[PDB]
Structure 1
Amino acid sequence: KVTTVVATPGQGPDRPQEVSYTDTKVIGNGSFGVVYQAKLCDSGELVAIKKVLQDKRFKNRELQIMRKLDHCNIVRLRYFFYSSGEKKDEVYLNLVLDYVPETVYRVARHYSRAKQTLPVIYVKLYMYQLFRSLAYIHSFGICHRDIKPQNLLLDPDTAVLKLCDFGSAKQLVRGEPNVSYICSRYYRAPELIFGATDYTSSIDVWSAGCVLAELLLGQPIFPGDSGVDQLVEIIKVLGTPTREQIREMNPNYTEFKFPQIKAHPWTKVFRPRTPPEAIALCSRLLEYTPTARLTPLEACAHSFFDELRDPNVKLPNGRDTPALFNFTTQELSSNPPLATILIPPHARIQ
């Protein structure tokens, strides 16, 4: 059983290609629509196909963003094409992507269920690779707006991490306002809970901070069914925000009196042998004030990741670490001087 389409390649020029695939399973649907898995007939390589309804007014914002992206830590759009199903009179956009077997979510929870934490080496690798992907897209003025473990793909063998689901992703432009109903429940930044629409890309950094902590703690750090329940868990950890800070998050000061709690000494939040540089990093991402949070690029160059810049560092299975230092000038444009930290001596050797 074999389907053959004519699909436009993700990057490169408009050179339509005949693509045949088979073994079409399904792997979840959800809001957008269905996601299939298939095997490309010639190469035998696995792909994921995200099939979503195509709006007849505007062209699809996810697609437009995916074509402008090329980065080692972002899922590759191989092809995209259009189809339907039965009479319908409605058109579907099909995004063909490189299949990646695992996700941080699934892995994180395998370790959680078997009451263990992920080895810190894997935490470093995954987090670094995320911040690179954020650094890259932020450099185009694009915010993901839905950083969460379920959207961090993994190849367990290679330790390669790839950011996916660009369905909420959008070119943020200072002056222009954006919907405050975007990010998933536990990974929402305070300014989003307070319903701000003047938010920047720093929401992604908050979100990432929540992922780090969760990998350290082995469970979400800021849980809760309601905005209120979450804000409590945040206040418990960060302490009660000063009148200034609330003014910085959402200036519209939504109008609630929070209970007055002191900051829980950040070190007293995690397991006893938790690397202190990991803890430091957390607190520089999970800041109330959006501007006071590290940039992705600054985080990549944090001391917590020093072990990745060691020339001897290998994966515990023995294979080399994946690409970590092949920065582009684009990717560094945030702050080029950091190249002196990010690209270690041993990577400059000829």
Structure 2
Amino acid sequence: SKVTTVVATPGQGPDRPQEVSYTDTKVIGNGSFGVVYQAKLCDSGELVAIKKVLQDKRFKNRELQIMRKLDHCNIVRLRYFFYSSGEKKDEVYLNLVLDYVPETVYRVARHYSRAKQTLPVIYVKLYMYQLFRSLAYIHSFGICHRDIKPQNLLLDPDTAVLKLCDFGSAKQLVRGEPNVSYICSRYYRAPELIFGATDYTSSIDVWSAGCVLAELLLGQPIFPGDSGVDQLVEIIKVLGTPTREQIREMNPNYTEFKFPQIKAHPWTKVFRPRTPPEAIALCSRLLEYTPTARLTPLEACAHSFFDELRDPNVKLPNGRDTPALFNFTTQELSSNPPLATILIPPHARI
């Protein structure tokens, strides 16, 4: 087959470019970002994804700057990066060589939905725990993903490994600095964002993760609607009408605007009867109006819902062992070090 050779800089470590050869290049994604390709490394035979985006030279690429700083088992690793041409003549493309993860939470959730089945609760715990670990990690550097949604959550169906992807909307949130409210995808946007808040925190990713949990439990999005108004109506139908205080906590420019006085709906009636109570309690705690009232990713990891993952007898339905779940770093635990008493179970490999 056609072999492409490039002089790529490694993602982590010293800036020491290497000749990287790859083959079997197929397009696997096309979006607002640019193009995502799948390719096989000639050396290892290992599969990779290459994200190709047009570079301005006007500034450094924000995604690359973020990607270069990260190393987590639940985040798609930046292996290399290089520059090229490809669609535009006289223009530069930045190419991010990333880990390849075969499936998306989006496609898997769709399979079950179509077959009128729900994703087994063991997978809901595995996928959600791993998402919270990735969130604890990025948040520990002050980095907010800002686009948490099923399409950005990659899975290995055989290993049960989830890896967060898309660092295109990612930004380091500094207190007092204003940020664009128009980030985040429909169904997954926190109420502060819908209200156009520019003072939001990393707790927007927690709201999004909570929407993803509720969707895997329901078999459909919890807060649908093609407009902010429709989305808010669906939120109010579950959470009840936000208080004047709760409105202030999100955006204080929307306090004088009248809302439909809906009763605070019991979260147990939202989900099917068989739904575990700890799953319901987790949603309740993530999907909160007051951004500060939401659990943190590290606290979410330590929630009762994930206890089965900490059981020494836990196994994957295919017989295999669970992937890495307890290899926490000092950085990863930094937000609340005592949580490691819950997080690292006695049996955890050492």
- Give the TM-score band, short-chain normalised: over 0.9
| Per-residue deviation, 1:15 | 1.6
TM-score by length of 2: 0.98
Q: Tell me the secondary structure at the aligned position of residue 131 of structure 2.
A: helix
| Per-residue deviation, 1:186 | 0.5
In structure 2, relative to structure 1, the CA distance for the partners of 1:156 and 1:348 (3 Å cut) is closer
Sequence identity (%): 100
Match of 1:77? 78
Match of 2:332? 331
Structure 2: gaps spanning 5 or more residues: none
| Per-residue deviation, 1:89 | 1.6
How far apart, CA to CA, are the structure 1 residues paired with 2:87 and 2:168?
25
Match of 1:25? 26
| Per-residue deviation, 1:35 | 1.1
Q: Tell me the secondary structure at the aligned position of residue 47 of structure 1.
A: strand
- 1:145–1:204 Cα contact (<8 Å) kept: yes
RMSD of the TM alignment (CA)? 1.1
In structure 2, relative to structure 1, the CA distance for the partners of 1:246 and 1:25 (3 Å cut) is same
| Per-residue deviation, 1:255 | 4.5
| Per-residue deviation, 1:162 | 0.3
| Per-residue deviation, 1:28 | 2.1
- 1:105–1:149 Cα contact (<8 Å) kept: yes
- 2:8–2:19 Cα contact (<8 Å) kept: yes
Match of 1:305? 306
TM-score by length of 1: 0.98
- 1:54–1:60 Cα contact (<8 Å) kept: yes
| Per-residue deviation, 1:251 | 2.1
In structure 2, relative to structure 1, the CA distance for the partners of 1:87 and 1:161 (3 Å cut) is closer
| Per-residue deviation, 1:29 | 1.1
CA distances 1:303-336 after superposition (whole Å, capped 9, x unpaired): 0000000011011111110000000010000000
| Per-residue deviation, 1:114 | 0.5
Q: Which moved more, 1:304-313 or 1:24-33?
A: 24-33
In structure 2, relative to structure 1, the CA distance for the partners of 1:348 and 1:107 (3 Å cut) is closer
Match of 2:136? 135
- 1:194–1:254 Cα contact (<8 Å) kept: no
- 2:244–2:255 Cα contact (<8 Å) kept: no
In structure 2, relative to structure 1, the CA distance for the partners of 1:266 and 1:316 (3 Å cut) is same
- 2:288–2:294 Cα contact (<8 Å) kept: yes
Q: Tell me the secondary structure at the aligned position of residue 273 of structure 2.
A: coil
Structure 1: gaps spanning 5 or more residues: none
Q: Tell me the secondary structure at the aligned position of residue 58 of structure 1.
A: coil
- 2:247–2:255 Cα contact (<8 Å) kept: no
| Per-residue deviation, 1:282 | 0.3
Q: Tell me the secondary structure at the aligned position of residue 252 of structure 1.
A: helix
How far apart, CA to CA, are the structure 1 residues paired with 2:241 and 2:263?
7
Q: Tell me the secondary structure at the aligned position of residue 253 of structure 2.
A: coil
Which structure 1 residue ranges, 4+ long, deviate > 3 Å from structure 2?
Answer: none
| Per-residue deviation, 1:86 | 6.7
